[PDB]
């Protein structure tokens, strides 16, 4: 399962 | 050692629509999933038979994560324009690499998670999983935000937990193929260049995983300086190929030996043109 990928630079 | 790795790439395309987002999944050297924002009906899909056992709730969850991630990456490409004072006319790339390696105790060996803007390091989670490294001054803005948001921690949580538990589940799913190493079948070919020089080519074919050592030895010392190593390439069936060539003098071929080793070889392989 992938991480939530919620990182806004 | 096994790993679970994900590769994210978003590409802006001014005047041609939303930036496209692609996410491919790897378990060791085998692609097992894939998501493409351009596909007619964007879905995380299996790309290996041993994932076909996973239920629709599984895939539907990933799809939701990926659609989110696709939007965030689009934001990021925008934000990046502001950071670098770039126009909305050019195309740009944003990438993420992350995953977990697992050691002989079946537990986290190395967690990694990095990002890049236009093919250059942007920001990365340090090996300690409790701090970041900013590549340039722009990423420093990002670093202050993620620290203040306690991002490192929850990213550590995933890598130590969800990521390795997933990896293990996937190893079990595809135990029949993932855990066995295909040895390389090696041989040497001979190609005269002139009456004085010949190219000896050492082939390694149909091996897995990708790692392999091809070295030419002239009795003792290996000839790294004058040999051509091609990058390891996919066979297309999940296996790999590679060769190493060495130009030598006519009559002297018997003096050079190719040394092959692979995880699936009990002991190094030694070849020669007879």
């Amino acid at each position: 399962i992938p991480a939530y990928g919620v990182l806004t630079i | 050692s096994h790993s679970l790795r994900y590769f994210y790439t978003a590409v802006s395309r001014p005047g041609l629509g939303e930036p496209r987002f692609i996410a491919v999944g790897y378990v060791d050297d085998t692609q097992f999933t894939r998501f493409d924002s351009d596909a007619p009906n964007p879905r995380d899909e299996p790309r290996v038979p041993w994932m076909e056992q996973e239920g629709p709730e599984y895939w539907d969850r990933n799809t939701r994560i990926y659609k989110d991630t696709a939007q965030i990456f689009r934001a990021n490409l925008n934000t990046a324009l502001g950071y670098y004072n770039q126009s909305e006319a050019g195309s740009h790339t944003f990438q993420e690499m992350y995953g977990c390696y697992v050691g002989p105790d079946g537990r986290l060996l190395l967690g990694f998670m990095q990002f890049a803007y236009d093919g250059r390091d942007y920001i990365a989670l340090n090996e300690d999983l409790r701090s970041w490294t900013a590549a340039d001054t722009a990423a420093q803005i990002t670093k202050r935000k993620w620290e203040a948001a306690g991002e490192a921690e929850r990213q550590r949580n995933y890598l130590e937990g969800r990521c390795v538990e997933g990896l293990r589940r996937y190893l079990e799913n595809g135990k029949d193929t993932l855990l066995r190493a295909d040895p390389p079948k090696a041989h040497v070919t001979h190609h005269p260049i002139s009456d004085r020089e010949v190219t000896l080519r050492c082939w390694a074919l149909g091996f897995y995983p990708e790692e392999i050592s091809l070295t030419w030895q002239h009795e003792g010392e290996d000839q790294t300086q004058d040999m051509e190593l091609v990058e390891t390439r996919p066979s297309g069936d999940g296996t790999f190929q590679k060769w190493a060539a060495l130009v030598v003098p006519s009559g002297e071929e018997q003096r050079y030996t190719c040394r092959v080793q692979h995880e699936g070889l009990q002991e190094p392989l030694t070849l020669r043109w007879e």
Binding site: - | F7, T9, V11, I22, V24, Y26, Q31, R34, D36, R47, S91, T93, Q95, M97, A116, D118, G119, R120, D121, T189, H191, R201, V230, E231, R233, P234, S235, G236, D237, Q241
Partner: protein, 98 residues
């Protein structure tokens, strides 16, 4: 920030006349991702499949274009690649020795 593609063209199994095989064009180590990879038969484009975009630890991309084919010691094959770092399309022959 641009890196030129490197190219290998090759078959999955050793080539033998009348024996079904797979033709591969492996293009890698390039940037940006925008690239055009066509398989050629006797100079003309054939239907080919392309792998999902991915990349290496150095952030450079790689792709695989491939097609089922049957070598016959008559037809020639090559790979054509267009990319921003390339003044004109590069063509790499399929040479069974490579």
């Amino acid at each position: 920030i641009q890196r030129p593609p490197k190219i290998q063209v090759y078959s999955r199994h050793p080539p033998e006349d009348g024996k079904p095989n797979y033709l591969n064009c492996y293009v890698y180590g390039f940037h940006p991702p925008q690239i055009e990879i066509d398989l050629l038969k006797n100079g003309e484009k054939i239907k080919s499949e392309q792998s999902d975009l991915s990349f290496s630890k150095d952030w450079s991309f790689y792709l695989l274009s491939h097609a089922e084919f049957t070598p016959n010691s008559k037809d020639q094959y090559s790979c054509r690649v267009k990319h921003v770092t390339l003044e004109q399309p590069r063509i790499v022959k399929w040479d069974r020795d490579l």
